[PDB]
């Protein structure tokens, strides 16, 4: 069970971090981006695209050049304000808490970068049900995230794994968030059991890219 | 790091002793030939000190390479298991390694999968004791788990919980220390304590180190 207090802490961390977010971005994402981009540019991101947890809009920029229309959901109005600065004409932002979310449309593709590791085990399944209902017939879900090597989990052998890590902002405020590293095989297996077909690959050391078809 | 976690960890290994070999260190069997090429580089010779010898898996190798082995472990149960190997040149002694100041020196000190059980607040004192046990010209070598260099910053955790919970067949459950350290991280920390170190990932998830006092 992941406490609701961890989940609120994570969203406030990002709320408060939003204005200094780009000063640090996601560690080493800038090293892994061309490798991830080879997958993102493979052609499945097109038509009407949904982006979840769009943050300050780094991925939203790429999604915007590939798609006709982008709908981009983030839990933080602050993040949405920062992303607004990129002036992307074909993008609508909506504030939305992703742990309390029932889509009412469908899109040709759904994309998220570094969101899934902030979804704890006990919410993973309801989150993936809503994504499933968000994807149109013929569409895919793609995402980027951190990964670990397949054997690490057994090397550690922890029956009660630490879901959380603690971060610190420029001004010294301290917040715990969810950070679950999942291997490509562990993700593939779990999503396969929820009815998805998945191609999940480490495309650069420490990063994976996934394509999942409902 | 509470005294309680230290004690819990030693109790875990004391109880696991009889069934340790049934499971061994996860994937060490995959890495062992890569670790053995370093173990046979020639530095393990003469009078050798092994720490946390456990059921004697590495002791057998050191026994074949050295003239004499002194092997230390906190668990009398582990020592009795290692006795079944019948190693003629090895002396076992029971020793709590968090309260240990050697009285003599050896040509080489070795341990496998011990350092990850030493939490950051006991690190320095453990290395002070090790340093005083190495003779002039000797080295310390060790094998352990590791991570790629970037994982720590990807995770970016201010207050790393170092504890993990293990549960034995019979249902008894224990907390132990399990700190993964990359080669660079270990290199920087030991250099700062005066050691000069060659630490390498020799098989994915495993490192081997050679350290000179
Ligand atoms: C771990 S993701 C960081 C990735 C960043 N969007 C990027 O795409 O480069 C952090 C984003 O998740 C958002 N977030 C955190 N909790 C949320 C929640 N419960 N619902 C929706 N968004 C959430 C934060 O607002 C932030 O934009
Ligand atoms: C992390 S090592 C496990 C693998 C084993 N070292 C091997 O050589 O393959 C566990 C060994 O360290 C020992 N140990 C745990 N705490 C100790 C302590 N405080 N002092 C000495 N030995 C300790 C246990 O008895 C056990 O044999």
Q: What is the 3-state secondary structure (H, E, C) of A73-95?
A: EECCHHHHHHHHCCCCCCEEEEE
Determine phi and psi for A119, rounding to 5 degrees: -100, 110
Four-CA torsion B48, B49, B55, B59, nearest 10 degrees: -10
A169 to chain B, any CB pair closer than 8 A? The answer is no
Pick the residue of A149, A152, A170, A181 with the most B CBs within 10 A to test the interface with B by mutation.
A152
B178 to chain A, any CB pair closer than 8 A? The answer is yes
> Measured between alpha carbons, how far is B177 from A157 in angstroms, rounded to an integer?
11
Q: How many CB pairs under 8 A join A and B?
A: 66
Domains of chain B plus CATH, in order, are 1-213 (3.40.50.150)
Can you list the pairs that B73-76 forms with residues at least 24 positions away whose Cβ atoms lie under 8 Å? B74/B10, B74/B13, B74/B14, B75/B10, B75/B13, B75/B14, B75/B17, B76/B14
| Header resolution in angstroms | 2.3
What are the chain B neighbours of A155 within 8 Å (beta carbons)? 26-27, 145, 180, 205
> Measured between alpha carbons, how far is A120 from A163 in angstroms, rounded to an integer?
7
Beta bridge partners of residue A93, listed in sequence order: A72
CA atoms within a 13 Å half-sphere pointing along the CA-CB vector of A118: 23
Structure tokens at B106: 């050896």
Helical (H) or strand (E) element with B189? helix B183-191
Chain A residue with minimum CA distance to B24? A155
Residues 6+ apart with CB under 8 A from A8: none
Q: Is the dihedral of CA B50, B54, B58, B59 positive or negative?
A: positive
DSSP state of A171: T
SS3 (DSSP) at A24? coil
Judged by CB atoms closer than 8 Å, whether chains meet at A165 and B173 is answered as no
Looking at ligand 1, which atom is closest to the CA of residue A29?
A: 9
> Measured between alpha carbons, how far is A156 from B2 in angstroms, rounded to an integer?
20
**Phi-psi bin for A59: left (phi > 0), alpha (psi -120 to 50), beta?**
alpha
SS3 (DSSP) at B25? coil
Judged by CB atoms closer than 8 Å, whether chains meet at A152 and B147 is answered as yes
Other C-beta atoms closer than 10 Å to the C-beta of A165 total: 18
Residue by residue, DSSP assigns A26-67 as STTHHHHHHHHHHHHTTS-S-SEEEEES-TTSHHHHHHHHH-
Q: How close B103 gets to chain A, by Cα (Å)?
A: 34
Residues 6+ apart with CB under 8 A from A193: none
> Measured between alpha carbons, how far is A100 from A84 in angstroms, rounded to an integer?
24
Pick the residue of A154, A157, A169 with the most B CBs within 10 A to test the interface with B by mutation.
A157
- Give which of B19, B69, B28, B25 is closest to B45, Cα–Cα: B69
């Amino acid at each position: 069970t992941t406490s609701h207090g961890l989940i609120e802490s994570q969203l406030s961390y990002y709320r408060a971090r939003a204005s200094e977010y780009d000063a640090t971005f996601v560690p080493y994402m800038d090293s892994a981006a061309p490798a991830a981009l080879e997958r993102l540019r493979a052609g499945n991101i097109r038509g009407d695209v949904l982006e979840l947890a769009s943050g300050t809009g780094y991925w939203t920029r790429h999604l915007s050049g590939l798609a006709d229309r982008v709908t981009a959901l983030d839990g933080s109005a602050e993040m949405i304000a920062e992303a607004g600065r990129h002036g992307l004409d074909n993008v609508e932002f909506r504030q939305q808490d992703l742990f309390d979310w029932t889509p009412d449309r469908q899109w040709d593709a759904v994309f998220f970068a570094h969101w899934l590791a902030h979804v704890p085990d006990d919410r993973f399944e309801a989150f993936w049900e809503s994504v499933r209902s968000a994807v149109a017939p013929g569409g895919v879900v793609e995402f980027v995230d951190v990964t670990d090597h397949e054997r690490r989990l057994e090397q550690q052998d922890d029956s009660e794994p630490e879901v959380a890590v603690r971060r610190t902002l420029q001004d010294g405020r301290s917040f715990r968030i969810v950070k679950v590293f999942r291997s490509p095989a562990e993700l593939t297996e779990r999503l396969t059991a929820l009815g998805w077909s998945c191609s999940v690959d480490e495309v650069h050391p420490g990063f994976l890219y996934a394509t999942c078809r409902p």
